Design a protein around this nucleic acid. Structure first.
Length: 36
DNA sequence: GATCTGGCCTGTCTTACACAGTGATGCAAATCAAGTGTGAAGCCAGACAAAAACCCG
């Protein structure tokens, strides 16, 4: 388990309740993990 | 005597005679680890209907 490991799923529902899909949901989550 | 020649001595020159196998490093490629809802390949439904292999009048 790494940062993105426990960051792609722990914050997954925060976009999965908006994005039905499951790449596009965590996609912008990767961008907000990269910005920081 | 004088020389010839033949035998022995080295002296070079030819082919040959044992290296891939050890443990280590160090990069490139693969995988894999989650996320989450998908569809796809079969599963099996008791019972029914078109073909290969061989019996049969």
């Amino acid at each position: 388990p790494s940062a993105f490991f426990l960051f792609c799923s722990e914050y997954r529902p925060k976009i999965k309740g908006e994005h039905p899909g499951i790449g596009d949901v965590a996609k912008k989550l990767g961008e907000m993990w990269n910005n920081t």
